[PDB]
Symmetry: C3
Subunit: 118 residues, 3 copies
């Protein structure tokens, strides 16, 4: 699982432990061990949301499975809550794109997660 | 809908009004209200296109529907036109990835748009 | 085809020649002419892999076709090898998302690559 946050919030406003908190929370939420989880936060971005440059975030979550209607709603509540609490971004100025990745289309460690066939 | 531009053009070369013009033109082209539209411009990037570092752009447009053959060709004309005029990037050094998003896969305001 | 690398490795550590080597190696691996290949490298990123801030990279490769089981494993070996050699990033701290794009969903030069209908 991989979570990316792009925001116009300044770098100094990103709490020091934010990456670890996202990692732990995403581990719990996805049921995947933390060792698999990647997080990427990009502050100070030039963005508009609804024509306004008030604090906002455009995000993506990639996962192999564990993606879908009810699950995604749960992720949104969790992640909007963290962005609101830690970065002070209103949940209605956050977008999160969810991607259900096929194991064959995720590369890692010189190979992919499609190990079953040649 | 959501549009991202990554370019090696310097931030200083990004004109006042650019984000707003993108927002307005995207609202027009996609038919979605301006309040929906998110735009994100990332200048000063380390990029090569065809092995050359002349001005170029790599872009994406996500949308719930309104993605398709003729529509995408129309978006490309619109967006390449703007990037050429405003950022002086040649249209043949722009790539735009189009994504048709399912509403259940776009999160917003503590939920998704399937709800 | 376009390849993006986001990494917490500092810009100073990105070696002269890196983008060009990516460009030429990707042309070779995809069998596509270099003229088509776009590369984008983003250093100095605030990111974690497994909760650790040791060097890591999150990457993507988009291609119209030439995406699939064996091909992607080959791309991974190639690109992890280059990231390891050039940026000193361990292959097990690299993720690469592969996207098989439809020609109708890739814009270029005022249009797309779907010209048939
Ligand atoms: C999550 C993940 C991380 C980076 C890019 C794309 C992804 F889907 C993930 C990583 C590894 C993994 C191994 C086995 C089963 N599932 C996995 C993931 O969902
Ligand atoms: C590769 C490519 C570049 C940018 C975004 C998405 C892509 F798939 C690519 C570029 C151009 C092209 C022309 C004809 C046939 N295939 C092509 C590609 O795969
Ligand atoms: C715009 C949008 C933003 C991020 C990802 C994908 C998108 F399409 C958008 C926001 C909300 C919305 C609601 C209903 C129908 N379409 C919508 C959009 O296109």
């Amino acid at each position: 699982p991989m979570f990316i946050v792009n925001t116009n919030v300044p770098r100094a406003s990103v709490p020091d432990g934010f990456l670890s908190e996202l990692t732990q929370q995403l581990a719990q939420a996805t049921g995947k061990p933390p060792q698999y989880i990647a997080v990427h936060v990009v502050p100070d971005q030039l963005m508009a949301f609804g024509g306004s440059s008030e604090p906002c975030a455009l995000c993506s979550l990639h996962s192999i499975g564990k993606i879908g209607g009810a699950q995604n709603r749960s992720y949104s509540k969790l992640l909007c809550g963290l962005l609101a609490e830690r970065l002070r971004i209103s949940p209605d100025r956050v977008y999160i794109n969810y991607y259900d990745m096929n194991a064959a289309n995720v590369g890692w460690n010189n190979s992919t997660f499609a190990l079953e066939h040649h």
